[PDB]
C-alpha cells in the first residue's frame, strides 16, 4: 500500500507474516519444518519467490543457503520444507487483495487448499474460510533493511575494501576505509523504476554504469536512464550477501575488475556469474 516495493515480484525476497500479527514470520526451524516465530530478520525467515509462467504460481524458497522450498505434504494436511523436486505440491498461487495487501497461498496441486496458521503457530493446508488465519502479508526484506539508509559497501573479496568514489575523479573504485564521504552511499528506492539509486555523500551524485569498452561505474548526475538504477538483491540462495543488477541490462552486475583488491581497483558492470568479485556486503553507516 502506497509503496510498490512489497509487490509480489519474481525473484524478490520476503518476510511472510500472518495478517493478525506483524511480529511473527514464517520461520524454517529445522531441515524439514516451518513454524511461525518472533521476527528476527534471520535468513531462515526470508523467502525468495520464483514464478512459473505456465502455472501462474510460485515456488517459495528459504534463503538460509539450504535451497529448501515450502511444500505441501500431500496427502496429509501438513506442510514442510524440502528439496526442489519440481512436483505440483511445491507450487503456490499467491493471490492478493488490492486494498488490504493480504495474500492467500493456494496450493497448485490442489487449489481448494490454502496455507493456514493456527493459534499454536503451526502451519497447515485447509479448505478455504473467511478467517484471517488464511491471510498473510508479504514484506520485501531489502526495502525494509536498506531504504533511505546511508550505507557502506564491502567487496566480498576483502573486508577492508569498500565501494569508493576516487579522490578528484568521478570514477568508482575499491579503497580501504578512511571514513570518507566518498565511501558512503544513500540507498533510495525509486517507485517508478521499482529499483534503487545509490548517492555518494561527497558530491550528491549517483552510482551509474558508464557504457563504453571500460564499463566503469562512476558518480553521475541524476537521470531517468536505466544505467543509474539497480536491482539490489540477495545471492541466489544466500541472504547474507548482495548482487547489484543494473536495470539497463539485468544480466550485468556491479563487479570488481578481475577480482583485484588493491586500492584503486576499478568497479565495473559485467556479465553475471555470481563469483566472489560480484558479491557485496552492505551495512548501515
Amino acid at each position: 500500500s502506497q509503496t510498490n516495493a512489497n509487490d509480489l515480484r519474481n525473484n524478490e525476497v520476503f518476510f511472510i507474516s500472518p495478517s493478525n500479527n506483524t511480529n511473527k514470520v514464517l520461520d524454517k526451524i529445522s531441515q524439514s519444518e516451518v513454524k511461525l516465530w518472533n521476527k528476527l530478520s534471520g535468513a531462515n525467515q526470508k523467502w525468495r519467490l520464483i514464478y512459473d509462467t505456465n502455472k501462474q504460481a510460485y515456488t517459495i524458497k528459504v534463503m538460509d543457503n539450504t535451497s529448501l522450498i515450502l511444500t505441501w505434504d500431500a496427502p496429509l494436511s501438513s506442510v514442510s520444507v524440502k528439496t526442489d523436486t519440481n512436483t505440483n505440491n511445491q507450487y503456490w498461487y499467491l493471490l492478493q487483495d488490492y486494498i488490504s495487501r493480504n495474500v492467500i497461498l493456494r496450493n497448485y496441486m490442489n487449489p481448494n487448499l490454502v496455507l493456514q496458521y493456527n493459534t499454536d503457530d503451526t502451519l497447515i493446508v485447509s479448505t478455504q474460510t473467511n478467517s484471517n488465519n488464511q491471510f498473510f502479508k508479504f514484506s520485501n526484506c531489502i526495502y525494509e533493511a536498506l531504504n533511505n539508509r546511508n550505507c557502506k559497501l564491502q567487496t566480498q573479496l576483502n573486508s577492508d575494501r569498500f565501494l569508493s568514489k576516487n579522490l578528484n575523479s568521478q570514477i568508482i573504485v575499491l579503497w580501504q576505509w578512511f571514513d570518507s564521504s566518498r565511501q558512503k552511499w544513500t540507498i533510495e528506492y525509486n517507485e517508478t523504476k521499482s529499483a534503487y539509486t545509490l548517492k555518494c555523500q561527497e558530491n550528491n551524485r549517483y552510482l551509474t554504469w558508464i557504457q563504453n569498452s571500460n564499463n566503469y561505474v562512476e558518480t553521475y548526475q541524476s537521470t531517468d536512464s536505466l544505467i543509474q538504477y539497480w536491482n539490489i538483491n540477495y545471492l541466489d540462495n544466500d541472504a547474507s550477501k548482495y548482487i547489484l543488477y543494473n536495470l539497463q541490462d539485468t544480466n550485468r552486475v556491479l563487479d570488481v575488475y578481475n577480482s583485484q583488491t588493491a586500492n584503486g581497483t576499478h568497479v565495473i558492470v559485467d556479465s553475471y556469474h555470481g563469483n566472489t568479485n560480484q558479491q557485496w556486503i552492505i551495512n548501515l553507516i
Binding site: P75, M109, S126, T127
Partner: protein
C-alpha cells in the same frame, strides 16, 4: 437419489483408476495400488439411531471416516462428523454426501485430479451441486 447398500466390507475406488483403492497407510488416507491387505478394506454400517452410514477401516476398528476443520476426510475416534449418505447414481457408483442441515449447500467426498492423476491426493469435503461431477463419484465394490 438411491441407497441400496447392505452392511458389510467394501473396497473404494475413484473414476480415475481401476488400480487405485482408498487405503489407510502412514496415518494418511489416499488412493494406492491394489493390495490384498486389510488396510484397503472398509466396513460399511448403516445406523438408524441418526440415519446414514459409517465407514471404518478393517485394519483399524474403533475409528471412523470423518471430516475435520481443514476439510480433510480422515480416520477419527470421533466427535463425530462421521455420518454419510451414499447417493446411488449407477450400478456401484455413489456420491458420498455429508448429512447435516437443510436449505444450505450439500457437501460430498471430493477427489481432485491433475489430468486423471490422483497420486497423493487426499479426499476433501467440498460443495456438491449435481450427480455429474467425476471428482465426487466413488465406486463401492462389495467383498
Amino acid at each position: 437419489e438411491r441407497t441400496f447398500l447392505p452392511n458389510g466390507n467394501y473396497k473404494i475406488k475413484s473414476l480415475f483408476s481401476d488400480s487405485l483403492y482408498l487405503t489407510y497407510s502412514s496415518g494418511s488416507l489416499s488412493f494406492l495400488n491394489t493390495s490384498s491387505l486389510d488396510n484397503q478394506k472398509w466396513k460399511l454400517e448403516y445406523i438408524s439411531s441418526s440415519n446414514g452410514f459409517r465407514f471404518s477401516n478393517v485394519a483399524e476398528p474403533n475409528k471412523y471416516l470423518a471430516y475435520n476443520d481443514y476439510g480433510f476426510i480422515y480416520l477419527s475416534s470421533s466427535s463425530n462428523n462421521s455420518l454419510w449418505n451414499p447417493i446411488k447414481i449407477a450400478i456401484n457408483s455413489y456420491i458420498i454426501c455429508t448429512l447435516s442441515i437443510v436449505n444450505v449447500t450439500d457437501y460430498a467426498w471430493t477427489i481432485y485430479d491433475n489430468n486423471n492423476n490422483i497420486t497423493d491426493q487426499p479426499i476433501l469435503n467440498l460443495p456438491n451441486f449435481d450427480i455429474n461431477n467425476s471428482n465426487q463419484i466413488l465406486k463401492l465394490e462389495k467383498l
